[PDB]
Symmetry: D2
Subunit: 185 residues, 4 copies
């Protein structure tokens, strides 16, 4: 049972919009865009439609550190929902999508199964915290927040959220969970 289930069902894809800050990731996420990033940032667009496709664009931006200086690094992704989405509703029982790399009209599938695992709604019915993950503990997982920092309490909840989702309790500390440096930026 190293297999992780979604906690947060019934997600209004409409309020998957605006800026989130990478708080922390597992190792498997550094493999593509994360490596050597500081001040990592996801500007999710809003929900968009091409016929029966629900999808959100993501602008990824970081200060990538090349030791003898930092270059800004920008890339667009496209989260496409795997199941088609009826135009009467904006809500899905589970957010389960294919993340593509996007440049002009060309697109390349990176992962066929990315999930919102956990979402905290705040007073104004919006996303304060998001955990994105695959169906397995070793597949790329990202903790992002409406804010650059979260108090130790928040962080232990988000980590406990990963547990109840079914991450090995052993993979919830330093070597396997890496804090993104959000300091200057």
């Amino acid at each position: 049972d190293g297999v992780v289930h979604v906690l947060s069902k019934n997600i209004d894809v409409k309020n998957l919009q605006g800026t989130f800050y990478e708080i922390a990731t597992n190792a498997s996420d550094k493999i593509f865009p994360g490596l050597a990033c500081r001040c990592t940032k996801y500007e999710f667009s809003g929900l968009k439609r091409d016929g029966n496709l629900g999808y959100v664009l993501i602008n990824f931006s970081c200060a990538r550190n090349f030791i003898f200086g930092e270059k800004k690094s920008e890339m667009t992704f496209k989260l496409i929902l795997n199941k088609p989405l009826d135009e009467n509703t904006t809500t899905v029982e589970e957010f389960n999508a294919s993340i593509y790399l996007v440049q002009g009209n060309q697109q390349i599938l990176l992962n066929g199964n990315i999930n919102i695992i956990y979402a905290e709604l705040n007073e104004q019915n919006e996303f304060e915290h998001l955990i994105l993950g695959g169906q397995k503990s070793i597949e790329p997982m990202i903790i992002m927040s409406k804010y650059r920092t979260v108090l130790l309490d928040t962080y232990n909840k988000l980590i406990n959220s990963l547990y109840l989702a079914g991450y090995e309790p052993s993979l919830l500390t330093w070597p396997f969970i890496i804090q993104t440096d959000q300091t200057f930026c």
Copy 2:
């Protein structure tokens, strides 16, 4: 002068065919595909014209290690030479090319200036060793070879090639140059 120069001119693209093994890379090669890679390999397709335009396909494979085990990892790349190439000739003054990530009928540009900096021919007019790289020491650079491993004399020679080419001398040692593990493949 700041810039990495091509040493190996008048290159017969016809013979950029077959497997080469990753010996060593700079840190910046890891930001994209090589992050946790053992046993890394590049199969070239040899020259392909689609008219006045010359290009080569690379199948990248590695045993990427997730700490709890290794999956295989397979991607395709497309080197499109920047100058056009006449149909009579199979040769170019310098190998200068844009590199694309490809998948099905999709291509995403990653870099407008990747070069063959140095190549070692044999009597049978074919590539023993290759160094690919950009114009600065901070763009990805790869040393690869006909052979899974190489004697120190050969490695000392390839690193020197990089010195002569204009690659900053203090960036030719460990933290900045990473030997690829080619044990057990």
Copy 3:
């Protein structure tokens, strides 16, 4: 690249108790800090052998061996480099040699470790300690009365390093490492 003390006229008496390691530079990982989580320092408070003053330090952490954690404990001695009359318990500048110690043996590690910056509170006890060398590249440690600190407090501590003469570009992720102070049962 010379760093100077900010905090002068420091009362050594009240350098006792438990400080948690918040952040180190890469240099400090060379000796006892590599792969440490939950890193803690217990100070003895001022001890004298006549005009010679010193302080003892119980270093402890949970070292991560990727497949589990050993508790690792060591003792260090800070000997003040200048003598210290049996009148006062205050020094113009805390400047000391640090020793590894085990029973009555003691091996010198560094002849210049300083208290760069110290924050006192109403009861004249230390909220935060920055320990450092004379060069930015020598080992540097940020430790607190508290296991975690607010982005605010951390920014104040980094500002202090700046004014002490750490290169502003040495004060971000690759060269300043946050210690994992979570799940420390």
Copy 4:
């Protein structure tokens, strides 16, 4: 997880002069081998304190501080754990304690280090040593008379680790680190 010595009846007389470090597991880095290139152990050959067999080691490396390399130089003392008769020069197993030393001071670091494997050359000397604890995750070091070794030699040495009781999975990159022996004065 339990390792047994393979090379028995070792002549400690001919544990002398200069070995170059080929490779290491993660655990050796924790003390001195961090950021070390060109790592080198000069053994003193067997010394006697009557009943006590012991060997000195001048450890030296080029330590990489990112912005330049200092020489790093330490002395160790290997005391054999069972007393050694002055008639014999040869132990059934080399099981010894390693101390850091500096002038007349010594501090125990590990009380159970073993020569697991010695390869004898025609002068009946050590071509190759493997040092190591009883446990796969204790510090292990593969060191050779030569700065490099042939893939065949490397595979033979890694094979010895398997026969001695290392998990097959801990014999590849993340856990076995090759030492950079490039650019070494």
